[PDB]
């Protein structure tokens, strides 16, 4: 069952064995992935998060981010630790009480403390549209049509060296998959379809690191949504999906009744499909209960290319049709050395006082804000351009902006910008050496918004900055509840911190 829009959510420790290997985890709702939180566009969500964690090896504090939801007027509910709140301590709870006006699509939720989401705190978050413009393109859209792709580690996250190339031990599709070494024939996920019906498959990357080459033998996939943004129909036979991205695609169950492999090949870790790694099963009703015998092609003839995507609505691009053609044009210097990432020369290390609380206490320019050099102010009601030139080790880096989606004016592996009709999204691969992936948005959402690589190991190694958008209006725009004001006193008391 789906839960929400008003629900409790308990965060607990438990042993799980999604690839046959038992390890302790940090779980929402007792499962990996966590339960789907859902509602309709414009609903009030009130997710009362109960921190019941006791195992210090995965951290007993927590904080949860609602990935891709803009949080306009509710910056305090966004979730990134030490940017918008102090963590929730064990034995306490916190009501994330917000609204989702003007958004409908496929999202997700995850811990936003350290690398804790890698240890298991990740699940889908769907905002349905009762008047969806894509409704006539499919028959079925429900919890059974959500497909999650996850990396899974046998080593606990707080034992992963900072700044290291950290590699997974299994790919999990809907919570199940097989280990790359010591492979056992543990259960594979099954996605069941009825011959003749059309399905809205909601593909969610809940990855902490790898990108996946996703395909379904014998089938193609018609993209209709990108990171919450409705798209024109684009038919492909393979989707390369980076960490934190989402796609909806129409799956037409138009092949003979049978069993077909679902494939998700990560860029690191186990390569191929030996022993059923990197795999799940598409089963038609009436098929024999047996593994597929299908083959992938040697090459995919119609892979997704990001510049092929275009919004369904006439979204256009803000600003002027050239580089620097914005009110506030920025170029970030993104670098890596000696185990640490930096942005504009500064490696991110979380501050003691959350950025939002520093601003509510009266600090009102970005040079007054901590961490020093990690906060950039943005002016209100202005077109912002951010160029993100690649080259830093550990790529391709999927950059994500909180509080906003953005036009992808230039994509990976293509030097040509698009000022007319590029897709809008919230997480974008910045590509490879010499690329100049560039994003644009307008500043109509006061508050501190994190910008970071969504490979969680890279965020932990400092690959982040904070956009303090419209500092002067942050306090009036974002009234805070008493329970939020109580978080930092409680957290600092529990950890013997003086602030
Ligand atoms: C990426 O595009 C940005 C512009 O969006 C380029 O920024 C210019 O950089 C040069 C020095 O390299 C400066 O003289 C200009 O002031 C910058 N802004 C402009 C021209 O609008 C940046 O060089 C590009 N990077 C790469 C690697 O192609
Ligand atoms: C490289 O990106 C550019 C810009 O998004 C793509 O150019 C567009 O190509 C479409 C499809 O043919 C034309 O309708 C547009 O007029 C082009 N726009 C511009 C600004 O040139 C281009 O197709 C991409 N390259 C590849 C190989 O896909
Ligand atoms: Cu996220
Ligand atoms: Cu986010
Ligand atoms: Cu990265
Ligand atoms: Cu974030
Ligand atoms: Na325009």
């Amino acid at each position: 069952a789906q839960i929400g829009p008003v629900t409790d959510l308990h965060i607990t420790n438990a042993n799980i064995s999604p690839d046959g290997f038992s390890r302790p985890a940090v779980l929402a709702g007792g499962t990996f992935p966590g339960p789907t939180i859902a509602g309709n566009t414009g609903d009030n969500f009130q997710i009362t998060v109960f921190n019941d964690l006791t195992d210090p090896s995965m951290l007993t504090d927590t904080s949860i981010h609602w990935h891709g939801l803009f949080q306009k007027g509710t910056n305090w509910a966004d979730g990134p630790a030490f940017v918008t709140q102090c963590p929730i301590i064990t034995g306490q709870s916190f009501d994330y009480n917000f609204n989702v006006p003007g958004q409908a699509g496929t999202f997700w939720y995850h811990s936003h403390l350290s690398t804790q989401y890698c240890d298991g705190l990740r699940g889908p978050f769907v905002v349905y549209d009762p008047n969806d413009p894509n409704a006539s393109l499919y028959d079925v859209d429900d919890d059974t049509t959500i497909i999650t792709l996850a990396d899974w580690y046998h080593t606990l996250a707080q034992q992963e060296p900072i700044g290291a190339a950290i590699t997974a031990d299994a790919t999990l599709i809907n919570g199940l998959g097989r280990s790359f070494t010591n492979t056992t024939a543990s259960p594979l996920s099954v996605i069941t379809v009825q011959s003749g019906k059309r399905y809205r498959m909601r593909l969610v990357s809940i990855s902490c690191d790898p990108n996946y080459l996703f395909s379904i033998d014998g089938h193609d996939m018609t993209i209709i949504e990108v990171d919450g943004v409705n798209s024109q129909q684009l038919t492909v036979d393979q989707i390369q999906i980076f960490a934190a991205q989402r796609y909806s695609f129409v799956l037409n169950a138009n092949q003979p009744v049978g069993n077909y492999w679902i494939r998700a090949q990560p860029n690191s870790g186990g390569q191929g499909f030996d022993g059923g790694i990197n795999s799940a099963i598409l089963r038609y009703e009436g098929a024999t209960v047996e593994d597929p015998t299908t083959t992938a092609p040697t090459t995919f003839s119609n892979p997704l290319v990001e510049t092929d995507l275009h919004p369904l609505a006439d979204l256009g691009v803000p600003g002027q049709p050239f580089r620097g053609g914005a009110d506030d044009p920025l170029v970030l210097n993104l670098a890596f050395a000696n185990g640490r990432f930096s942005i504009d020369g500064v490696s991110f290390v979380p501050p003691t006082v959350p950025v939002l609380l520093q601003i509510l206490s009266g600090a009102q320019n970005a040079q007054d804000l901590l961490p020093a050099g990690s906060v950039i102010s943005l002016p209100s009601n202005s077109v912002i351009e951010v160029a993100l030139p690649a080259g830093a080790a550990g790529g391709p880096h999927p950059f994500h902006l909180h509080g906003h989606n953005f036009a992808v004016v230039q994509s990976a592996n293509n030097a040509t910008p698009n000022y007319v009709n590029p897709i809008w999204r919230d997480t974008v691969s910045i590509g490879g050496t010499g690329d100049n992936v560039t994003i644009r948005f307008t500043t109509n959402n006061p508050g501190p918004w994190f910008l970071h690589c969504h490979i969680d190991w890279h965020l932990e190694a400092g690959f982040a900055i904070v956009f303090a958008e419209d500092i002067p209006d942050t306090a009036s725009a974002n009234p805070v509840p008493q329970a939020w004001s109580d978080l930092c006193p409680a957290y600092d008391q529990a950890h013997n911190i003086s602030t």
Side-chain angles (χ1 to χ4, degrees), residues 211-224:
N211 69 71
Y212 293 94
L213 300 173
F214 180 83
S215 63
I216 302 172
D217 288 355
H219 294 72
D220 60 18
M221 301 178 281
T222 301
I223 297 166
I224 62 165

Side-chain angles (χ1 to χ4, degrees), residues 45 77 94 142 159 179 184-185 222 241 243 290 315 330 375 412 419 442:
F45 284 82
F94 182 68
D142 63 22
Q159 298 165 22
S179 58
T184 63
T222 301
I241 186 174
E290 60 193 357
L315 300 184
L330 299 171
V375 185
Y419 301 110
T442 302

Side-chain angles (χ1 to χ4, degrees), residues 75-434:
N75 175 266
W76 64 263
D78 190 41
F82 308 104
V83 177
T84 60
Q85 70 176 90
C86 287
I88 308 163
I89 68 174
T90 188
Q92 295 200 344
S93 61
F94 182 68
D95 185 358
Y96 289 94
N97 178 1
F98 62 87
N99 300 291
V100 298
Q103 295 189 270
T106 310
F107 305 95
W108 62 297
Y109 63 93
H110 57 83
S111 180
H112 211 308
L113 175 67
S114 184
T115 53
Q116 188 186 65
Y117 91 76
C118 308
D119 285 332
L121 207 180
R122 342 181 191 168
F125 189 116
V126 180
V127 179
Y128 294 101
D129 186 349
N131 287 167
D132 201 309
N134 290 318
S136 70
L137 300 179
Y138 53 80
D139 306 304
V140 184
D141 178 21
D142 63 22
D143 220 33
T144 77
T145 68
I146 297 169
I147 306 178
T148 60
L149 304 181
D151 52 340
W152 191 251
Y153 302 81
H154 293 173
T155 298
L156 270 44
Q158 303 297 323
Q159 298 165 22
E160 306 281 20
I162 316 293
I166 283 155
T167 67
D169 295 301
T171 300
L172 308 178
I173 301 170
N174 290 354
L176 295 173
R178 292 177 180 166
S179 58
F180 303 142
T181 62
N182 190 212
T183 309
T184 63
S186 53
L188 298 182
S189 288
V190 180
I191 295 181
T192 302
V193 293
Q194 179 183 334
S195 185
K197 294 193 179 172
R198 303 156 292 178
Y199 295 77
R200 185 185 182 144
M201 299 293 192
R202 297 181 181 256
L203 185 64
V204 184
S205 172
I206 66 179
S207 189
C208 265
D209 179 330
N211 69 71
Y212 293 94
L213 300 173
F214 180 83
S215 63
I216 302 172
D217 288 355
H219 294 72
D220 60 18
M221 301 178 281
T222 301
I223 297 166
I224 62 165
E225 182 213 333
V226 184
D227 301 1
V229 176
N230 291 338
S231 69
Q232 295 175 350
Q233 289 172 70
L234 182 69
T235 298
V236 301
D237 63 352
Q238 183 179 63
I239 294 171
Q240 184 170 29
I241 186 174
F242 302 86
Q245 290 181 334
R246 294 83 61 216
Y247 292 97
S248 293
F249 64 90
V250 178
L251 185 75
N252 192 352
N254 66 357
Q255 300 302 295
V257 166
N259 295 288
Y260 299 80
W261 291 117
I262 298 170
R263 298 179 186 283
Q265 165 66 72
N267 59 315
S268 62
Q271 300 299 298
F273 307 94
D274 289 353
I277 67 170
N278 293 330
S279 302
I281 299 176
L282 181 78
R283 179 161 294 141
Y284 282 63
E285 292 174 1
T288 305
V289 175
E290 60 193 357
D291 286 353
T293 61
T294 59
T295 199
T298 56
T299 63
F300 290 81
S301 65
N302 291 287
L304 174 62
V305 173
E306 187 174 69
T307 56
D308 288 345
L309 293 161
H310 304 291
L312 185 62
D314 182 4
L315 300 184
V317 180
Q320 300 166 286
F322 53 84
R323 305 191 190 285
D327 301 305
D328 187 9
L330 299 171
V331 182
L332 302 184
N333 181 341
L334 303 175
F336 175 86
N338 300 323
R340 300 280 304 175
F341 290 89
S342 63
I343 302 191
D344 289 355
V346 182
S347 190
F348 192 83
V349 175
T352 302
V353 180
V355 183
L356 176 59
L357 185 50
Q358 294 176 51
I359 292 168
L360 298 184
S361 303
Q364 294 178 59
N365 81 311
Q367 299 105 278
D368 281 1
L369 290 172
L370 304 182
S374 295
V375 185
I376 296 180
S377 72
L378 304 178
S380 69
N381 300 318
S382 291
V383 184
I384 315 304
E385 179 177 80
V386 191
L388 304 164
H397 301 285
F399 267 72
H400 169 57
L401 178 60
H402 293 218
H404 285 280
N405 57 20
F406 50 72
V408 186
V409 310
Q410 184 165 321
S411 293
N413 210 44
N414 179 339
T416 306
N418 182 357
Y419 301 110
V420 178
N421 64 355
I423 201 62
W424 288 57
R425 75 186 308 152
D426 68 43
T427 303
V428 62
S429 175
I430 71 171
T433 166

Side-chain angles (χ1 to χ4, degrees), residues 341 393-394 396-399 453-455 458 463:
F341 290 89
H397 301 285
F399 267 72
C453 181
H454 216 296
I455 293 167
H458 299 177
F463 211 14

